Amino acid sequence: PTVFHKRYLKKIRDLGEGHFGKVSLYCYDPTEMVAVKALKAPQHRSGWKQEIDILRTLYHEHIIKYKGCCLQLVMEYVPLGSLRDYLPRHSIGLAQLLLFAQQICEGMAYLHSQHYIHRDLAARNVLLDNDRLVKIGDFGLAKAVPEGHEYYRVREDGDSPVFWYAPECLKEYKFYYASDVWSFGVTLYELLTHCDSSQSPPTKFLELIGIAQGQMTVLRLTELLERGERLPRPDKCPAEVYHLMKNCWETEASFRPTFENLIPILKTVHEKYQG
Ligand SMILES: N#C[C@H]1C[C@@H]1C(=O)N[C@@]12C[C@@H]1CN(c1nc(Nc3cnn(CCO)c3)ncc1F)C2
């Protein structure tokens, strides 16, 4: 739609980076603040084409706004950044954390109804607009679920967010809509630990696995997940919220709530704490 011209984009700062992509804050000055995502200098390029196409077709209050092209991806600038960056610095209350959790489920329910799985649902991908507004802000691993199949066939990459993954992704390389609920449960844990690094999923799971394990991190991970071991209950996380988390972490994908199931549950649980 909108065609931003590169010569008018004024770099302000970096907002994020991955092994294949970078997001920068720009000032579009043809005489507005934009987040522009660029792929680094064919498989990652084809995946990049699908990424832009995926966000082009998404419109939801809890999904970062697609703003047009420049290929570079121009998106709205979400002012307070990732909850991963925000949370260790702002002691947000339980009620607001649960509102964020609900807002994530809404955007996820919407994403899922569009037949897309996210595959990278983490606090680093949840952007804070204001103290009462959150948006899923990155779709780098988002894929369409093929029409005659209930999941997408992943394939291992060294950069897979394995500490946010259900055993089916790690073992069978099958990503279901239910696999994003697992990730959501991990994002909910992150939010309740205030994104504290010493409490993070890679820190906590590597403490459980150990680091002398050769090529066997994923395998030791899958087997502890299969033994029913899980991330611990965050300090000051209510018993009920912890049980909802564990329910998101059922080993059986079908036993997990869907995002639709989570919306009324979170709505009720937020209303309770907001009082
Ligand atoms: N892998 C990989 C890496 C490259 C992919 C990446 O950076 N994706 C993103 C989720 C990050 C941030 N981001 C965006 N961030 C913002 N706002 C904003 C304000 N402060 N900050 C920094 C404190 O977090 C960010 N508005 C739009 C965005 F799009 C998009």
Ligand 1, closest atom to CA 82?
Answer: 24
For residue 236, what are its two tokens?
């000051």
> Cβ distance 88 to 23 under 8 Å?
no
Both 66 and 105 in a single domain? no
H-only helix segments in the chain: 43-56, 83-86, 94-113, 167-171, 177-192, 201-209, 217-226, 239-248, 259-273
What is d(CA 183, CA 248) in angstroms, rounded to the nearest whole number? 8
Both 113 and 205 in a single domain? yes
| The residue type at 94 | L
> Cβ distance 27 to 98 under 8 Å?
no
Both 45 and 92 in a single domain? no
- What is the Å distance from ligand 1's center to 138 Cα? 7
Q: Say how many C-beta atoms besides its own lie within 10 A of residue 209's C-beta.
A: 17
- What is the Å distance from ligand 1's center to 243 Cα? 31
Domain end among 24, 49, 77: 77
Both 133 and 233 in a single domain? yes
Least Cα distance to 63 among 120, 18, 122, 127 occurs for 127
From 14, 53, 85, 120, active-site residue: 120
Q: Residue 116: give its domain's CATH number.
A: 1.10.510.10
Q: Residue 2: give its domain's CATH number.
A: 3.30.200.20
Both 214 and 247 in a single domain? yes
What is d(CA 227, CA 242) in angstroms, rounded to the nearest whole number? 18
Ligand 1, closest atom to CA 80?
Answer: 19
Instruction: Scan for tokens 């002398």, then name that residue.
Output: 212
237 lines ligand 1 (CB under 6 A): no
- Best residue for ligand 1 mutational test, from 63, 70, 127 (most atoms within 8 Å of Cβ): 127
- At 89 the three-state DSSP class reads coil
Overall domain count for the chain = 2
Name the closest-CA residue to atom 8, ligand 1: 138
Both 238 and 134 in a single domain? yes
159 lines ligand 1 (CB under 6 A): no
Backbone region of residue 29 per phi and psi (left: phi > 0; alpha: psi in -120 to 50; beta: other values): beta
Both 57 and 106 in a single domain? no
Least Cα distance to 120 among 144, 136, 134, 103 occurs for 136
Q: Which residues contact 13 (CB under 8 A, 6 or more apart)?
A: 24, 25
> Cβ distance 45 to 95 under 8 Å?
no
Domain end among 77, 96, 123: 77
Least Cα distance to 266 among 14, 119, 96 occurs for 96
74 lines ligand 1 (CB under 6 A): no
Give residue 188's domain range.
78-275
Both 196 and 88 in a single domain? yes
Catalytic: 120? yes
- At 28 the three-state DSSP class reads strand
Both 16 and 32 in a single domain? yes
Ligand 1, closest atom to CA 120?
Answer: 1
What is d(CA 272, CA 275) in angstroms, rounded to the nearest whole number? 6
Least Cα distance to 37 among 4, 9, 71, 79 occurs for 71
Ligand 1, closest atom to CA 19?
Answer: 1
Both 139 and 262 in a single domain? yes
Rounded to a whole number of angstroms, the CA Rg of the chain reads 19
What is d(CA 95, CA 84) in angstroms, rounded to the nearest whole number? 18
Both 115 and 169 in a single domain? yes
> Cβ distance 83 to 123 under 8 Å?
yes
65 lines ligand 1 (CB under 6 A): no
Both 94 and 229 in a single domain? yes
Domain end among 55, 77, 99: 77
- What is the Å distance from ligand 1's center to 125 Cα? 7
